[PDB]
Ligand binder design. Structure first.
Ligand SMILES: [Mg+2]
Ligand SMILES: [Mg+2]
Ligand SMILES: [Mg+2]
Ligand SMILES: [Mg+2]
Ligand SMILES: [Mg+2]
Ligand SMILES: [Mg+2]
Ligand SMILES: [Mg+2]
Ligand SMILES: [Mg+2]
Ligand SMILES: [Mg+2]
Ligand SMILES: [Mg+2]
Ligand SMILES: [Mg+2]
Lengths: 127, 107, 125, 198, 188
RNA sequence: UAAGUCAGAAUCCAUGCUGGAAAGCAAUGUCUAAGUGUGAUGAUAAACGAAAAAAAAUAAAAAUUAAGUUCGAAAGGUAGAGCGGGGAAGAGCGAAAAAGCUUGACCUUAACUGCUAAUCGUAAUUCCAAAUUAUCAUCUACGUAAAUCUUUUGUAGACGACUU
RNA sequence: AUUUUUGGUAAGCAGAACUGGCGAUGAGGGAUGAACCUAACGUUGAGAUAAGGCGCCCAAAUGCACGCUCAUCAGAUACCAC
RNA sequence: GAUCGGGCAGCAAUGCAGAUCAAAAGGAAAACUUCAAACUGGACUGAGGGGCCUAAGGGCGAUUUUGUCAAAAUGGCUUCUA
């Protein structure tokens, strides 16, 4: 977790090298808060605010039967946005890898997925 | 591939609808969540969203189908809870396992 | 055989109560189903012998109907605390308490530590 | 109730109770297998339960005995009738419930290996005052002429002997792996975990 | 569900009897007078209940009826020390299908309320008595020289030991309850 | 007689006997042309560790009050690595419903290393395994064994059925 | 039907009194069933109940505490089946 | 200080230890009843389509944001199932 946007969404980085979850808008509701915390000493969040993730959507109109695809201009714009993001990430991920790399298993622990064990009891669990 | 990697849903059973000897409300299903035992523990799931998945002929390229609902309330003092779905669950469903999911996390 | 008895001044475990997981001593036997209970961490209670488990600690210093205070003293002098604390029972119990407090990372660790204990034993030398 | 197949060892279990439990489990989707039925217990004089089973032998469809009730004399079926009694067995749902239960006497092949389970509430020791009367099923099925008791015993012994083999091997090796767990390299990791809240 | 203060934390373990003192006077109510006050000890589960018990006994014992008198007050009595075991005697009259009977009973308990509750349960089970029918004549906390019953005197010794011969398995909370487990419990 | 024990009936249960389409099971003779043939669509009262083998005893013991256990558990990828996992043939053992266990050509994979993850846009089953089996379409094989009717017998028979 | 009643050995018989009810009336409970128990009905969702229940058929306690009981004919409750 | 007993002593005469009741002088606390103040998680619902109104605080009885939807999708029909 990085910071909480004004829209309310959570700002998020799986370190894209470790997780594969690159940089994400997420909802508070859809997540579980672990007591494991990594410091971001490299906090860059000022860069990123809501308007950062837009997207451009095709026109679904009553004359095309809401049958839509994106134009070439759109392919381009979106490609450019993507490269831009790829860049902006390393900025954030970079101090991250570092901070995370200094915590013993935290790299693997981040790489891993969270499953329930049969015997588990999510209602009494301590995270 | 051997299995699905991570399944984050708790297993629930569909007991039946909420009923009296001669009468049944089919609006309220009853579930028993795995390793959920007393009213206290059931309460923990109060708002939670629960799914009913089943398979069938191809509908929009997916061979499965779904009914979504929420556990609302503790039914009786062992672990049993009323669930409401969008479409009241079909009755053969009774023998079966439903997915309790942890999605509803709020402040 | 019959070595462990319910006696005036027995050391008992309170299970299935508001007081579960707590040691206590027995001052009197009220009928055949209920005993009179005390200790540092528990009010003076009447409890059905059913809810209780005999601990194999008999304090012969205890006296019939002993006041809460004097009891607490005798109990302290006996080290129910140290003695029980060494018990396989309390050891296991504490271990449980440990497992209780563990986070996602703690589990994960334990898992990698668990895998290692397995795959590494070939280290003869 | 969620384990894929429960297998219950009916030994020292009380008929009616083991019954109700397995029944519910069945209704709610648990697929069960009960074993060693010949070992189930019933509260009462063996006599009294023979009186009773006799009284049952006595019921029949008048004009045509070969229609309707079949009076089954094996412990397996005694239990089975018992459970069918506690389900709505004429209901398609009840049917399913039934199909889930399989029952045997002794412990047949597929079931050597799988772990046998117990219903705690159903135990003679747990349920009945020690000095009150009881029967084992196979004794009843004896009085009513189910011939296999002797065979089952022999067969059981055979399997007991395979057990001692499994176990002994399992012990020997499992001591050797516990001993080598106390060696230096791993003693380290042991300590790491203990501290970790073993 | 209204607890009297001297009842146990677990409502299960004892009946809802409490011991009351009720006192009233002939209705005419003359001011400066030095009234005859009629006072009685009743065991009931309510103030209301106590009033009933009161009046019943009072109309049997004396001329008075309720339209003829006034209730001055109802005061619950409490037991001194819940720290010791005491042997209580109780003297009863109850009504069995044939006739009416005077009984003397003893219970070892921590409260006179407990003595009574135990008395009622017993009287139901062994004698099929109806609570409403039961009349407690007199109640005494017993001095050792005075305790007559064998199941009472049975428990006086310090050398008292019960092995617990059979332990019926009873999980600690519900959270631990399983129908079927992978191994068999033990007794001891 | 309450526990505990003997004797003991034209009784009861068996033994013997007749049925036995119990939509039960076994052993055995021969055959099933052509392939451990493929394709598409499907169904299975219930896949996402739906994980897990001592035996016996509950008035036992020197000693352990709960499977309130233990084991497994990392990315539904690629390239390497290879703790480890699975197993041809044949040879061993194994029968209560023979379910499988050993050895074994070989097949495979975890730590670790590099790529690849992001635009599936703050959720909508995480559609993939295993055991079964239906339908349609097709490629190869145009064969093999046996039965029945049209005959026959009278050890049987209303007709079918049955012996031959 | 409750209570009160007369003839009658008696009757799920024959007659009377007050209040109901059933007929003309469904719903839940007494397994079952005109006159019992709760309760009186427009279509529908929620909640908490009455009568009655909560081992399984069956929603809900194999709850927590008491007393008493072993039947080679146990017992299991209003109107109810003696 | 006084009683008592289901103590250890003691051969007895007696002491140690208790438990109950308790003087003046001090301490420190539990359960119940009543009446109040306040936090957090759920379920069901949103009838109506104004500018009027006032105790000057508000009332008059849900708004906001976002995602998906072209394909038989949604609703229905016939048949069947629970
Ligand atoms: Mg004999
Ligand atoms: Mg006869
Ligand atoms: Mg009257
Ligand atoms: Mg008449
Ligand atoms: Mg009247
Ligand atoms: Mg009336
Ligand atoms: Mg008419
Ligand atoms: Mg009516
Ligand atoms: Mg309703
Ligand atoms: Mg019980
Ligand atoms: Mg449709």
């Amino acid at each position: 977790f990085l910071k909480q946007l004004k829209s309310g969404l959570l700002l998020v980085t799986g370190p894209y090298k470790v997780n594969g979850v690159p940089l994400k808008r997420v909802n508070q509701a859809y997540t579980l808060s672990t007591s494991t915390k990594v410091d971001l000493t490299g906090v860059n969040t000022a860069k990123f605010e809501d308007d950062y993730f837009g997207r451009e959507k095709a026109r679904k109109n009553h004359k095309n039967l809401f049958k839509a695809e994106l134009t070439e201009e759109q392919k381009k714009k979106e490609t450019e946005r993507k490269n831009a993001r790829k860049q902006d990430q390393q900025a954030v991920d970079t101090p991250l890898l570092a901070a995370v790399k200094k915590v013993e298993f935290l790299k693997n622990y981040l790489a891993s997925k969270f499953t329930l064990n049969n015997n588990d009891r999510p209602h009494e669990m301590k995270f | 591939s051997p299995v699905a990697p991570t399944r984050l849903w708790v297993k629930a059973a569909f007991t039946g609808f909420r009923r009296s000897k001669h009468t049944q409300n089919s609006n309220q299903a009853l579930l028993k969540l795995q390793n959920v035992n007393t009213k206290e523990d059931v309460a923990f799931y109060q708002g939670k969203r629960v799914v009913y998945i089943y398979k069938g002929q191809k509908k929009n390229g997916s061979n499965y189908r779904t009914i979504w609902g929420r556990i609302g309330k503790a039914h009786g003092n062992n672990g049993v809870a009323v669930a409401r779905f969008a479409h009241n669950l079909p009755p053969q469903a009774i023998g079966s396992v439903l997915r309790v999911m942890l999605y509803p996390n709020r402040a | 055989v019959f070595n462990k008895f319910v006696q005036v001044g027995r050391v008992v475990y309170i299970n299935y109560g508001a007081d579960k997981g707590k040691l206590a001593v027995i001052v009197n036997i009220i009928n055949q189903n209920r005993i009179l209970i005390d200790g540092e961490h528990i009010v003076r209670q009447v409890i059905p012998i059913r809810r209780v488990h005999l601990t194999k600690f008999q304090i012969d210093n205890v006296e019939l109907n002993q006041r809460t205070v004097l009891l607490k003293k005798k109990i302290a002098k006996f080290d129910l605390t140290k003695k029980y604390a060494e018990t396989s029972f309390a050891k296991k119990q504490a271990i449980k308490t440990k497992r209780a407090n563990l986070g996602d990372f703690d589990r994960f660790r334990v898992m990698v530590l668990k895998k290692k204990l397995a795959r590494t034993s070939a280290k003869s030398k | 109730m969620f384990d894929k197949l429960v297998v219950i060892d009916a030994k020292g279990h009380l008929l009616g109770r083991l019954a109700s439990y397995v029944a519910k489990e069945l209704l709610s989707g648990q697929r069960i297998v009960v074993v060693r039925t010949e070992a189930i217990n019933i509260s009462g004089s063996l006599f009294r339960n023979r009186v009773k089973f006799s009284e049952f032998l006595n019921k029949w469809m008048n004009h045509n005995p070969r229609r309707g009730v079949q009076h089954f004399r094996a412990p397996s079926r005694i239990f089975w009738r018992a459970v069918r009694g506690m389900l709505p067995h004429k209901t398609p749902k009840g049917a399913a419930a039934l199909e889930r239960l399989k029952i045997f006497e002794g412990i047949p092949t597929p079931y050597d290996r799988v772990k046998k389970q117990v219903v705690v509430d159903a135990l003679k020791v747990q349920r009945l005052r020690n000095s009150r009367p009881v029967c084992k099923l196979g004794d009843l099925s004896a009085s009513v002429g189910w011939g296999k008791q002797t065979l089952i015993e022999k067969l059981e012994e055979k399997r007991r002997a395979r057990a001692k083999t499994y176990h002994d091997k399992k012990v020997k090796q499992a001591d050797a792996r516990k001993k080598e767990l106390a060696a230096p390299a791993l003693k380290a990791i042991k300590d790491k975990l203990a501290q970790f809240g073993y | 569900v209204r607890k009297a203060a001297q009842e146990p934390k677990d409502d299960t373990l004892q009946m809802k009897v409490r011991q009351y003192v009720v006192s009233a006077a002939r209705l005419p109510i003359e001011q400066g007078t030095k009234p005859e006050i009629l006072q009685m000890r009743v065991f009931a589960r309510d103030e209301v209940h106590a009033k009933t018990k009161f009046w019943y006994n009072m109309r049997k014992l004396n001329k008075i009826k309720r339209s003829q008198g006034r209730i001055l007050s109802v005061n619950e009595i409490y037991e001194k020390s819940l720290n010791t075991v005491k042997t209580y005697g109780i003297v009863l009259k109850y009504q069995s299908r044939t006739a009416i009977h005077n009984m003397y009973k003893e219970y070892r308990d921590v409260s006179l309320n407990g003595a009574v509750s135990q008395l009622i349960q017993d009287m139901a089970g062994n004698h099929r008595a109806q609570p409403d029918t039961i009349q407690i004549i007199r109640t005494a906390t017993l001095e050792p020289k005075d305790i007559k019953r064998p199941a009472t005197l049975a428990m006086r010794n310090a050398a008292l030991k019960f092995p617990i011969v059979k332990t019926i398995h009873r999980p600690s909370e519900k959270k631990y309850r399983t129908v079927y487990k992978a191994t068999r419990p033990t007794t001891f």
